[PDB]
C-alpha cells in the first residue's frame, strides 16, 4: 500500500491492512495480536517493540482485552 | 543553549571529537530538522542520554543548522516532513521499496545522506537493535543480512552520498505576507502572514481568511538550515504546526491541526510590496453562461484586466492582496487565460464536468478515544471534477481538472465480506464535507469475535447539475490504532 | 496424567492440571519481563526451562515449589544476545541448545555477529560450546536420540551438536520449485512433544496457475519426524485462511491447524478433515497424550481445549488475571500419574 503511507507491507498478518487487502485477517480483536506484535517487535514502526526499545510499555495491562487504556502512544503527540 | 555546548558536555561521553574537528557518526550524516529529532530522542530513550527541554532543541536545532539538507535535496519527498495525507510512498525499485520501506516509509531514507561507512553502521544498527527483522515478511524469503552486505549497503553508499551541508538562511524574514492556498474540506483561502524577529526566532501571525469568514493564529517560527520553516501557533484552545520551505522570499508548504495532522492546508506566501505576481485564484474554473465571483490572490495586482474573446466582466475590488473579479464564460469548454496586472490568469470554461474522483481514492482513518490515551485518525476525502479533454480519454494522463466541487457522501461495505461483518454500520461515518469520523476503539462486545470497530469501506460521493451522472469511489480502510509515531512515517 | 506449562505476562510459568481442568502452580521468575518465550519441560515433568528477560536470559524452576534453581544471562556488557525462540532441552535431560543472535556493542556503534547455538549443561548451567549457526533459525529441537539438532531456517538445517558443525540442509526454500512457489513460513512455536513431530503450515502457489487466479494459492504442511528423522512436505488444501501454528497428534495421523479457525487435518489423505471458527484469535496448538483433546493458546490469556474429532470445544481454562500468552511457546508434558 504505497498510498498507505506510515502503514507496514509486512503481512504476518500484518498492521493497517492485511495480505489480502482487508481488515478481516488481521487479528480479532486487535488485542489479541497487539503483543504477539510487541513482544517480538514484528512492527516496530506502528506497534511499541518491548524487545528492546520499549521493554516496560504494557506494564500494568497484563490482561489486554481489560486494560488496553493503559498503552501509551510512544510518540508525544505532535506533527 | 547552544549546540556546540550540548555536543561537549552531552554528546561528548560516547561521541569522540576525532583532531579534525568533526565528530564521530554526527560528522558523517545529514538529515533534515525531523530526522535530527528522531536521532536525538533515540540517544535519550534507548541510551540515557540525559537532556532538559532547552538542551534537546539546542542540540536539535543546531544539527538541523549545520548539517541539514538543500530544499532541492529534499525534492519528491516533502510529503514525509508535511504530514501530507494524500501521498505515495516508495523506493526506487522493488528490493528497496521492499527492503527499506516496509516499515516506515522510503522517505525516510531518501530524506538522508551519509558516507558508505555510516550507512554500513546504519544497517547494523536496524538489525541489532530489531533483531527479527530479518525474521519478517520480505526478510525471512532471503539471505536478508548477505543482501544487506553485498547489495544494500552499497547501494545507500552509491545513491545517498555524504555530500556538503548547504550554507544557513542568512536574511531577515522578518514583514508582511500576502498568501494564498486551500484547505480540503473547507476551501479556498487567502490571508497574511506576518513575521517579526526575536533573537535567533521569529513572532509569527497567520491569517486565514475564507468566504464565510477569517480567523488569526499566532505563535513562534524559525528557519532551520537552508531553509526548511518550523513554526507552531494557536487560537483559543487550537494550535497548528507550519511546515514550509523558505526560498527567494516566498513560502511553500502545509500547515496542519497540531492535535490531527490529516487536517491541515497548503499555501504559498510572498511579501506584501512585492511586485505583480499571482499567488493563486479561486475559484479556478468559470460556469459558462454564468456570472461568477472570483477572488485573484497575488502582490500588486491592481485592475488592469485584459480579457479573452470567451470571456467578459470586470474588477469589483482590489488591494490587500486580492482582486476580486466578476466573470462570465460564454463558448465551447476548455483552458481560458486573462492577465490582470501584466500576470497572467488560468482558469477553465465548462458547462458540466465529465466525471468526478475522489480525492484521496485509497486510505486509512484509525479508531480511538473510548478512555484511551489515543485520538481518533479521521480521513477527509475531497470530489475533483474533471474534463476528458482533447482526446476525450475519460481518465487519462492529459484530463483537465476542475477543482473540488460540493457533494453528498456516504459510506458502504466494499464487498460482500464487509457486508455480511456489517462493517459500515459499525466502523463509522462521513458527513457532508466529505470528512469521515471513525468510531471507538477496543474490542466491541457487539461484534463477532468481539472485534474492533475495524472496517472495509467504500466511500461514496455525489456531485450536481447537467446530465447529473457525477458519482466516484474511495477504498477506505477503517483500521486499528498506532502506537508508535514519529517525526517522520 | 498431562499437564500444561504456559507463560503468563510479565514473569510467571503456569501449571495447568488438564484433568482438573484447572491451575495447578503459578510460578513466578525475577527480572523475567515484559514475558517468558520458550519454557521446556525435563523429563519426569518436576523440572523447567524458560528463557526469559526479552530473550536474552534462561532460568530453571522447580515446577512444584516454584523457586528458581539457575540462571543463565546470555547477554553480556559488549554483547547484547538474543535466544529469540530459540532453546531446547535434549531428550535425556542433559543438555541445553540455546540460539544466540548477537549484536557487539561498540561505543556509538553496533556491529552485528554470528548467530551462534550455544550448548549448556542443565544441571550446573554451564556454558560448554559455542558454534555458528546459520541465521534466520526459529525453533531449535532434539532427535529424539540426541544425536543431532535441528534449526528451523530459510532450509531445515541438520546440526552435529558435538562436532558444532552443519552436516545437513533439508530443503525448503527450494522445495518442489518447478511446481510450486518459494514456500513462505512463520512458526515460532515449539509444541511438538506430544508427537515427537516439529510441524508448521506453509504457503505457496501453483507456477502454472494465474497468480491472480485465487486457485492458485495452496497451503502446506511441513513436518519434521524428529525420531526417524525424516521431514515430508506437502500441500493439504487450496488456501483459503491462515494459520499461525499446527500440532500433529500422537499417532502422527493428524495435525491441527489454528488462528481464526480450528482446522484438523487428515496426514494419510494430506486432505481437511473439518473446520471450526474461534471466538478470538489463537496463536498455539498442542495434543493431548491420548490424542482425543487439541489445546489452543498464546494471542490472549486463556488455553481452549477441543474434541480431536468433532473439534467441539470441551472448556476453557483461564490464566491468572487472564494474563496475555502472546506468542510465547505453551507445552504439554505429563507426571507418572
Ligand atoms: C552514550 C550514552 C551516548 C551518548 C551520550 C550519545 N550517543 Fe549517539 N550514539 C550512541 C550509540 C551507542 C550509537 C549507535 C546505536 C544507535 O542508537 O544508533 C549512537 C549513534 C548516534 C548517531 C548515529 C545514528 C544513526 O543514524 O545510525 C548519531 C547521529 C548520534 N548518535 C548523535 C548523538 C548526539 C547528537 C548526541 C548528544 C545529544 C549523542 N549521540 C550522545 C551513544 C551515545
Ligand atoms: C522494520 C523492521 C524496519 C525495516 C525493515 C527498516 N527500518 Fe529503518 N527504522 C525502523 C525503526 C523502528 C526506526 C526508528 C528507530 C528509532 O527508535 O529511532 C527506523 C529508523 C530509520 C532511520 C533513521 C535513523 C536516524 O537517522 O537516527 C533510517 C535512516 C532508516 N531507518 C533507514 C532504513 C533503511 C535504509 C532500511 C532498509 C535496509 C530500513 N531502515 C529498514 C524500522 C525499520
Given at each position: 500500500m504505497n498510498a498507505l503511507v506510515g502503514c507496514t507491507t509486512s503481512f504476518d498478518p500484518g498492521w493497517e491492512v492485511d495480505a489480502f487487502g482487508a481488515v478481516s485477517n488481521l487479528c480479532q480483536p486487535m488485542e489479541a495480536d497487539l503483543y504477539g506484535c510487541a513482544d517480538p517487535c514484528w512492527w516496530p514502526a506502528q506497534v511499541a517493540d518491548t524487545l528492546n526499545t520499549y521493554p516496560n510499555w504494557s506494564a500494568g495491562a497484563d490482561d489486554v482485552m481489560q486494560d488496553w487504556r493503559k498503552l501509551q502512544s510512544v510518540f508525544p503527540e505532535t506533527k | 543553549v547552544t549546540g556546540e555546548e550540548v555536543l561537549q558536555n552531552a554528546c561528548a561521553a560516547c561521541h569522540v571529537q576525532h583532531e579534525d574537528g568533526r565528530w564521530e557518526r554526527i560528522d558523517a550524516a545529514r538529515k533534515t530538522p525531523e530526522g535530527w529529532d528522531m536521532t536525538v530522542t533515540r540517544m535519550m530513550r534507548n541510551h540515557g542520554v540525559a537532556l532538559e527541554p532547552e538542551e534537546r532543541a539546542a542540540i536539535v536545532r543546531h544539527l538541523s543548522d549545520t548539517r541539514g539538507l538543500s530544499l532541492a535535496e529534499t525534492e519528491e519527498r516533502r510529503y514525509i516532513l508535511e504530514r501530507e495525507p494524500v501521498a505515495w510512498d516508495?523506493?526506487?525499485?522493488?528490493?528497496?521499496?521492499?527492503?527499506?520501506?516496509?516499515?516506515?516509509?522510503?522517505?525516510?531514507?531518501?530524506?538522508?545522506?551519509?558516507?558508505?561507512?555510516?550507512?554500513?553502521?546504519?544497517?547494523?544498527?536496524?538489525?541489532?537493535q530489531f533483531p527479527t527483522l530479518e525474521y519478517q515478511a520480505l526478510a525471512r524469503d532471503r539471505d536478508w543480512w548477505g543482501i544487506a552486505q553485498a547489495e544494500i549497503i552499497p547501494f545507500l553508499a552509491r545513491t545517498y552520498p555524504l555530500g556538503e551541508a548547504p550554507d544557513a538562511y542568512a536574511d531577515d524574514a522578518s514583514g508582511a505576507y500576502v498568501l494564498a492556498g486551500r484547505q480540503p474540506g473547507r476551501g479556498?483561502?487567502?490571508?497574511?502572514?506576518?513575521?517579526?524577529?526575536?533573537?535567533?526566532?521569529?513572532?509569527?501571525?497567520?491569517?486565514?481568511?475564507?468566504?464565510?469568514?477569517?480567523?488569526?493564529?499566532?505563535?513562534?517560527?524559525?528557519?532551520?538550515?537552508?531553509?526548511?520553516?518550523?513554526?507552531?501557533?494557536?487560537?483559543?484552545?487550537?494550535?497548528?504546526?507550519?511546515?514550509?520551505?523558505?526560498?527567494?522570499?516566498?513560502?511553500?508548504?502545509?500547515?496542519?491541526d497540531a492535535d490531527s495532522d490529516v487536517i491541515g492546508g497548503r499555501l504559498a506566501a510572498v511579501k506584501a510590496?512585492?511586485?505583480?505576481?499571482?499567488?493563486?485564484?479561486?475559484?479556478?474554473?468559470?460556469?459558462?453562461?454564468?456570472?461568477?465571483?472570483?477572488?485573484?490572490?497575488?502582490?500588486?495586482?491592481?485592475?488592469?484586466?485584459?480579457?479573452?474573446?470567451?470571456?467578459?466582466?470586470?474588477?469589483?475590488?482590489?488591494?490587500?492582496?486580492?482582486?476580486?473579479?466578476?466573470?462570465?464564460?460564454?463558448?465551447?469548454?476548455?483552458?481560458?487565460?486573462?492577465?490582470?496586472?501584466?500576470?497572467?490568469?488560468?482558469?477553465?470554461?465548462?458547462?458540466?464536468?465529465?466525471?468526478?474522483?475522489?480525492?484521496?481514492?485509497?486510505?486509512?482513518?484509525?479508531?480511538?478515544?473510548?478512555?484511551?490515551?489515543?485520538?481518533?485518525?479521521?480521513?477527509?476525502?475531497?470530489?475533483?471534477?474533471?474534463?476528458?479533454?482533447?482526446?476525450?480519454?475519460?481518465?487519462?494522463?492529459?484530463?483537465?481538472?476542475?477543482?473540488?466541487?460540493?457533494?453528498?457522501?456516504?459510506?458502504?461495505?466494499?464487498?460482500?465480506?464487509?457486508?455480511?461483518?456489517?462493517?459500515?454500520?459499525?466502523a463509522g461515518s462521513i458527513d457532508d464535507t466529505g470528512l469521515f469520523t471513525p468510531a471507538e476503539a477496543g474490542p466491541n462486545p457487539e461484534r463477532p469475535m468481539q472485534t474492533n470497530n475495524a472496517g472495509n469501506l467504500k466511500v461514496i460521493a455525489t456531485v450536481d447539475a447537467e446530465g447529473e451522472p457525477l458519482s466516484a469511489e474511495a477504498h477506505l480502510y477503517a483500521t486499528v490504532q498506532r502506537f508508535v509515531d514519529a517525526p517522520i512515517r | 496424567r498431562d499437564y500444561i506449562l504456559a507463560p503468563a505476562r510479565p514473569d510467571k510459568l503456569v501449571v495447568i492440571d488438564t484433568e482438573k481442568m484447572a491451575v495447578d502452580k503459578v510460578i513466578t521468575i525475577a527480572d523475567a519481563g515484559p514475558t517468558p518465550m520458550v519454557p521446556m519441560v525435563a523429563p519426569g515433568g518436576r523440572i523447567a526451562y524458560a528463557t526469559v528477560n526479552k530473550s536474552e536470559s534462561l532460568v530453571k524452576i522447580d515446577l512444584v515449589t516454584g523457586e528458581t534453581l539457575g540462571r543463565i544471562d546470555l547477554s553480556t556488557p559488549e554483547e547484547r544476545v538474543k535466544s529469540l525462540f530459540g532453546?531446547?532441552?535434549?531428550?535425556?535431560?542433559?543438555?541445553?541448545?540455546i540460539y544466540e543472535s548477537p549484536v557487539r556493542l561498540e561505543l556509538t556503534h553496533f556491529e552485528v555477529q554470528p548467530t551462534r547455538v550455544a550448548l549448556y549443561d542443565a544441571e550446573t548451567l554451564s556454558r560448554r560450546k559455542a558454534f555458528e549457526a546459520p541465521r534466520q533459525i526459529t525453533m531449535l529441537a532434539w532427535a529424539r536420540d540426541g544425536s543431532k539438532l535441528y534449526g528451523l531456517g530459510r532450509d531445515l538445517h541438520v546440526m552435529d551438536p558435538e562436532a558444532g558443525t552443519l552436516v545437513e540442509d533439508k530443503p525448503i526454500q527450494s522445495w518442489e520449485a518447478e511446481t510450486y512457489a518459494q514456500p513462505d513460513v512463520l512458526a515460532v512455536w515449539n509444541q511438538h512433544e506430544s508427537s515427537?513431530?516439529?510441524?508448521?503450515?506453509?504457503?505457496?502457489?501453483?507456477?502454472?496457475?494465474?497468480?491472480?487466479?485465487?486457485?492458485?494459492?495452496?497451503?502446506?504442511?511441513?513436518?519434521?519426524?524428529?525420531?526417524?528423522?525424516?521431514?515430508?512436505?506437502?500441500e493439504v488444501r487450496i488456501m483459503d485462511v491462515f494459520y499461525f501454528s499446527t500440532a500433529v497428534n500422537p499417532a502422527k495421523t493428524r495435525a491441527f491447524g489454528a488462528y481464526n479457525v480450528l482446522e484438523s487435518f487428515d496426514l494419510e489423505k494430506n486432505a481437511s478433515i473439518k473446520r471450526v471458527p474461534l471466538p478470538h484469535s489463537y496463536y498455539s496448538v498442542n495434543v493431548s497424550t491420548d490424542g482425543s483433546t487439541v489445546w489452543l493458546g498464546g494471542a490472549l490469556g486463556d488455553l481452549a481445549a477441543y474434541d480431536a474429532e468433532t473439534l467441539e470445544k470441551k472448556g476453557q481454562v483461564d490464566l491468572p488475571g487472564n494474563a496475555s500468552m502472546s506468542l510465547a511457546s505453551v507445552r504439554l508434558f505429563t507426571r507418572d500419574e
Open positions: - | 516508495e523506493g526506487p525499485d522493488t528490493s528497496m521499496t521492499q527492503t527499506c520501506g516496509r516499515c516506515h516509509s522510503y522517505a525516510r531514507v531518501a530524506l538522508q545522506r551519509r558516507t558508505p561507512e555510516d550507512w554500513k553502521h546504519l544497517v547494523n544498527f536496524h538489525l541489532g479556498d483561502y487567502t490571508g497574511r502572514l506576518v513575521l517579526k524577529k526575536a533573537g535567533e526566532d521569529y513572532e509569527v501571525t497567520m491569517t486565514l481568511d475564507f468566504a464565510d469568514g477569517s480567523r488569526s493564529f499566532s505563535g513562534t517560527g524559525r528557519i532551520l538550515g537552508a531553509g526548511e520553516w518550523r513554526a507552531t501557533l494557536s487560537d483559543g484552545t487550537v494550535t497548528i504546526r507550519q511546515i514550509f520551505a523558505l526560498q527567494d522570499g516566498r513560502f511553500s508548504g502545509r500547515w496542519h510590496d512585492a511586485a505583480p505576481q499571482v499567488l493563486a485564484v479561486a475559484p479556478a474554473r468559470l460556469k459558462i453562461g454564468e456570472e461568477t465571483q472570483l477572488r485573484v490572490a497575488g502582490t500588486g495586482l491592481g485592475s488592469d484586466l485584459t480579457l479573452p474573446e470567451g470571456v467578459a466582466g470586470s474588477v469589483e475590488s482590489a488591494g490587500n492582496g486580492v482582486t476580486v473579479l466578476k466573470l462570465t464564460a460564454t463558448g465551447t469548454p476548455g483552458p481560458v487565460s486573462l492577465e490582470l496586472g501584466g500576470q497572467k490568469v488560468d482558469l477553465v470554461a465548462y458547462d458540466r464536468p465529465d466525471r468526478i474522483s475522489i480525492v484521496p481514492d485509497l486510505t486509512i482513518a484509525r479508531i480511538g478515544g473510548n478512555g484511551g490515551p489515543i485520538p481518533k485518525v479521521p480521513a477527509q476525502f475531497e470530489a475533483m471534477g474533471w474534463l476528458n479533454g482533447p482526446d476525450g480519454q475519460p481518465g487519462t494522463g492529459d484530463d483537465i481538472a476542475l477543482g473540488a466541487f460540493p457533494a453528498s457522501w456516504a459510506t458502504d461495505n466494499f464487498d460482500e465480506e464487509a457486508e455480511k461483518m456489517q462493517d459500515a454500520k459499525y | 532453546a531446547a532441552l535434549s531428550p535425556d535431560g542433559k543438555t541445553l541448545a515427537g513431530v516439529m510441524a508448521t503450515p506453509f504457503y505457496t502457489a501453483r507456477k502454472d496457475i494465474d497468480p491472480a487466479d485465487p486457485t492458485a494459492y495452496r497451503t502446506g504442511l511441513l513436518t519434521m519426524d524428529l525420531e526417524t528423522g525424516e521431514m515430508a512436505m506437502r
